[PDB]
Amino acid sequence: MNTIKTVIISELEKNVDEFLNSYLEYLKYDDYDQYCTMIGLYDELTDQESISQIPTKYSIDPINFQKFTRVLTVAIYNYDVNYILAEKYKELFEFTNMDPDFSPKYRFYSPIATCSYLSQYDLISESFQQDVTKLFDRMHKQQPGCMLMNQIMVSNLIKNLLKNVQ
Amino acid sequence: GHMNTIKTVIISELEKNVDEFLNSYLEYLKYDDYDQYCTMIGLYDELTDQESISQIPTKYSIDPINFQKFTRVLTVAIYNYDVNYILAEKYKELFEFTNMDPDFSPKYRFYSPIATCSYLSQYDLISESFQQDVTKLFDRMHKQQPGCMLMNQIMVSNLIKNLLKNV
Amino acid sequence: GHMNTIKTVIISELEKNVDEFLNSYLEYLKYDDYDQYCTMIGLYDELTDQESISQIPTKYSIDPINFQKFTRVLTVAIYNYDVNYILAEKYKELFEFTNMDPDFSPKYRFYSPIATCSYLSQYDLISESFQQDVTKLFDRMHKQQPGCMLMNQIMVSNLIKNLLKNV
Amino acid sequence: GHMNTIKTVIISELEKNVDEFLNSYLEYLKYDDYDQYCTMIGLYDELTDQESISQIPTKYSIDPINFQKFTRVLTVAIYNYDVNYILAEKYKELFEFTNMDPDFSPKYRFYSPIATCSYLSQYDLISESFQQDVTKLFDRMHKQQPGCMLMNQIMVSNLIKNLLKNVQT
Ligand SMILES: [Zn+2]
């Protein structure tokens, strides 16, 4: 609402919403309804207190809250620029035990394609970090050249805009 | 925090992409055409008043048909990177000279400069129906473009709109 | 003797394209002019000495001014397909018969024979200023040519030029 | 010089266009993918036997996925510049490695390297149907090409074919 960084964050979160909406295709019944409730709330998941209160405040099962946070971390990985989203959700990474400094060498993949591959991984696996690392690597090897250049153009343009304090 | 420097910051960023666009079309030019075009790349942000537009070709020894062709390549570049017509507003005197449509804005923008110039090299830049050719150009690029790229092209265009409105 | 084979075959191939240029110009001739030009297309490789050149009208029963018009059109075709002046040096005496510049070479060559003959149709072939008309002809086609075509024309010229190096 | 030297002169000239073709695709690569591809541009003329094809990636630290993608871009370049299959014959062991069709030949050749690489950047280089993608690639460029460009591409191919008539191989 205020600065360039806050507006960029809100715009990146709009794309995080679309990423999370793409995963909804693979959820059903009550898990679908709890996940939808989480999409409209995750920007509160910035401190350990709020992280522990909202699953019970909004009646979300601990397993569904666990699975949502892991899909949210992959979304953050896909849309982050200069770790501004990883820093904002600093305490979310401490809750889900995932690397806050990981960043794939290419970002802004298709949310439909990314969730299509993510749908066949065990979200709460102890090896989920390396599963995410292999997921972006596979999409990198698969991606045509024109798409990758578009992806680095998006990241570079946002990086240049963030350098503008004056 | 607000003011108008966000619009200035965005314009400088969009003009960096205009630079790469203009450099990409250099691949289709040799000899004097290449030399004159390179001179215009360093001068195009001065094409904001009718006096400069008049003096540039004779002052820098630019063939008038090469000046006309450059302003048309530059216009296609503006079409490809403009958001909320801020570039068209800044270069409103350029549109007054070229007589190109200042309200034209393609369905999707921020196409690859190499891909766009490859299509643009197929057209007669001094055609009297060049405006219709530009419309065909952006339509052809949209009908071939995968949805994954069009996604990000909308994303950047919406991000810049958000930055401009909400400072 | 492979380098002389390369130069001989390349000269023969360029003349094949001169033939197709001359065949395209037949569409602008009617009735008797058609017949004599068809003949001259088959014998222009004999126009290498002033003796032969002067004997052509009497030997082949060709109108003297239809021959001189043919030599002018042939000169334009040589300009359009020459590389390293191998055609200009072979037909050097023809350039002395027509008094056309054997050192002239346009910035780009290998234009369309259909497009070239269409513009050439507007010129008087035996005008004394036909050399300046030819300069306008190639300069006009350069100005109207899309960038992708010009890059294909220079690609063709560079490849043949590189094959001829060290001859 | 013997007539068969004409073949060597032509191959040397066609590989110059292969170099420009390979340098054009560099626009669609960044970081270490760009670096490994650059190293391969200066080594592809050694990919004429299976033992060299096997050892070049290890000796120069090229990742198998990048080596495979390089050989597929090299194959499209060979398709775009070959005449009388002289390049496909010289690099027949490359076609053995890539499993690409050594007998494929587009309707026209000598398309612009910038335009072709722009089309090529839209495709998955390691797709199982890449051969079908290549066929469609050249067919798309054919149907969009203006006739005067095509006729110059015919003229160059015909000139090289006539030169090769003097070669008994
Ligand atoms: Zn020899």
Side-chain angles (χ1 to χ4, degrees), chain A residues 1-5 7-8 10-12 14-15 79 107-113 143 146-148 150-151 153-154 156-158 160-161 163-164 166, chain B residues 1-2 5-6 9-10 12-14 16-17 81 109-112 145-156 158-160 162-164 166-167:
Chain A
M1 303 307 215
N2 254 7
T3 78
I4 300 183
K5 176 167 168 173
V7 171
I8 284 174
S10 82
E11 193 69 22
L12 293 180
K14 288 189 195 175
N15 294 273
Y79 297 105
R107 267 151 274 102
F108 302 108
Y109 290 93
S110 176
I112 296 102
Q143 200 79 314
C146 65
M147 295 183 184
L148 289 176
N150 164 279
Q151 294 167 241
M153 178 272 295
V154 178
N156 258 312
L157 187 141
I158 305 170
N160 291 340
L161 294 178
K163 293 171 52 214
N164 291 89
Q166 288 175 236
Chain B
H2 281 242
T5 188
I6 174 61
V9 161
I10 292 298
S12 67
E13 188 62 27
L14 300 181
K16 295 155 87 167
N17 292 273
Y81 298 117
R109 300 188 303 279
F110 291 88
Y111 289 92
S112 163
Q145 198 86 326
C148 315
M149 341 190 53
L150 297 173
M151 285 179 345
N152 292 358
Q153 294 174 234
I154 283 295
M155 185 191 311
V156 186
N158 288 345
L159 189 150
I160 299 176
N162 191 351
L163 277 173
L164 286 171
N166 306 289
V167 318

Side-chain angles (χ1 to χ4, degrees), chain A residues 13-75:
Chain A
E13 288 169 345
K14 288 189 195 175
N15 294 273
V16 172
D17 301 336
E18 209 57 49
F19 189 102
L20 299 174
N21 272 262
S22 298
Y23 196 91
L24 275 179
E25 181 171 319
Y26 312 105
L27 295 152
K28 204 190 179 194
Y29 48 93
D30 190 57
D31 297 9
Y32 173 90
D33 278 61
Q34 296 181 20
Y35 189 101
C36 289
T37 300
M38 283 307 302
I39 300 181
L41 301 170
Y42 69 84
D43 56 352
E44 286 181 12
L45 301 174
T46 48
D47 57 83
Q48 316 291 353
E49 306 144 62
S50 309
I51 282 171
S52 50
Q53 315 279 2
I54 67 98
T56 54
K57 170 172 165 166
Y58 288 85
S59 165
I60 289 134
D61 299 336
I63 173 63
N64 287 338
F65 182 67
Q66 278 290 346
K67 289 178 178 174
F68 172 82
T69 54
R70 258 126 139 87
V71 183
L72 174 61
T73 51
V74 181

